[PDB]
């Protein structure tokens, strides 16, 4: 069976070990624009034959997995829909939003004879490292172009991945995600943005944070590009999560305004019980 | 010395301590209305005596720490204005506000002849004398604040290994609303909005992994302080909701206008400054719990 992975980034370089693992049979192709990290993958073997040309390699592949930006992502997918592929080739996304990468896959691949299903596998606390997904999620999204057999196939495919599978309506996915991924990020460099302009005028905000401001800002330390696609193709969900964010910040200022502790006090505490109930 | 602490908890155990620590000479008189913590603060060591009626040691008192919630600090406050204290005793608290605290202090205690300052001593890293240890005990001088104040407070608590700062009541108010009280406020808002979520989307719970985990962990503190916190910190605490507020309107311009530079702009200039202001080797707790 023949495996072409586009990206070779931190995901692609995984995924690739990954499959490797229980599938040294297997003859993993590679796409990556970068020659640099497209020889590295080389030498670390972590493909067999690797390209700059994503088109030169996707005529000979049994299953497609991008593993680019969502931007790209949905580029490639329409750019596959013109090439002539294997009959009922596998092929999937990696993107951390699901619904509109998967619109763009039913709308150019469908009358293809391709099949596709949405990916998101979640990654790990972090270069490639077959580690990098066990016990975490690898999440499916059914798609119209989603053939019984699909789903059932990748999951052999990426037993390596010591992953945990699940299945789950491509929109659900997004609101989910937006919940307790997406808007949290949000939010992290939303306080880091705010504690970094007070501290021009209260020149002691950079020396008094503790473990509290720590914790609820170290995602904010990441990577923008990905976050910025994320929060451009999940846009409704996250809209909807900071209308609702500022009603709940305006009832807290009505009662601190209301001189209300008692219900300040229930809120914390509705908040301590939740924390724990998991 | 004779050295008078209203707490048990905590905080006044953990300043019995650590000021014995270097201070074995020391008598430690303790308060606490709770029959049985105040005996496991003596069979422990922890004082010398204990008592549950604070105007009984009160008098004997040559310095007097409220270690008490906010409003039991204040109520105490007011007390300690009718009872007879040693000359020139000193006085503070441990509030995690300041600004009332001191307005209290002022209002009730002037006039008379006592020192008070302002107290808040942040944690590090049941009565740990390593609490304090390299972490911020803040004083913030009051107009009962004598200029002997303060120092001899320094030598008092030099047990702590703490790092000695002074700042106005109302700039530590500022400031601990902006890296803690409302910090605290995002923390439990956003696990509420999540857990009201999880009861229409059953993944919500599933789903959630670390960067969640971290963003509302400290949602699991003790109420009852917060609750005191936040009403006492009112003013900051609501300006800090406005401004967030324009913040997340911005962003959501941004999704609307579809600006994805913008946005990249928005997450970049947060990680800057999360690096810059090299927040990743901060630690602690602001609010000793």
């Known amino acids: 069976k023949t495996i072409y992975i586009a990206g070779l980034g931190l995901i692609g370089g995984s995924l690739a070990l990954g499959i490797k693992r229980d599938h040294p049979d297997y003859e993993i192709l590679g796409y990556n624009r970068s020659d640099y990290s497209r020889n590295i993958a080389l030498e670390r073997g972590i493909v067999d034959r690797a390209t700059g040309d994503f088109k030169e390699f996707a005529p000979l592949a049994d299953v497609i997995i991008l593993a680019v930006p969502i931007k790209q992502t949905m580029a490639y997918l329409k750019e596959l829909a013109d090439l002539d592929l294997k009959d009922n080739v596998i092929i999937t996304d990696a993107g951390s939003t699901k619904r509109e990468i998967v619109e763009a896959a039913e709308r150019y691949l469908t009358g293809k004879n391709v099949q596709f299903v949405g990916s998101h596998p979640m990654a790990g606390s972090h270069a ?98 990905m976050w910025a696609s994320i929060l451009m193709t999940n846009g409704p969900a996250v809209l909807d999560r900071i209308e609702d964010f500022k009603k709940r910040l305006d009832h807290v200022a009505d009662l601190i305004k209301a001189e209300d502790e008692s219900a300040i006090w229930e809120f914390f505490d509705n908040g301590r019980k939740k924390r724990k109930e998991m």
């Open 128 to 225: 490639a490292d077959v580690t990098l997904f066990e016990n975490a999620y690898y999440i499916f999204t059914p798609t119209s172009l989603t053939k019984e057999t699909t789903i059932p196939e990748l999951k052999d495919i990426l037993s390596g991945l010591k992953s945990r599978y699940v299945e789950i309506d491509a929109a659900e996915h997004d609101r989910v995600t937006s919940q307790i991924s997406h808007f949290p990020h949000l939010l992290a460099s939303g306080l880091m943005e705010q504690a970094a302009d007070y501290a021009q005028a209260h020149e002691m905000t950079n020396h008094f944070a503790a473990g509290g401001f720590r914790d609820m800002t170290r995602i904010a330390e990441s990577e923008p590009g």
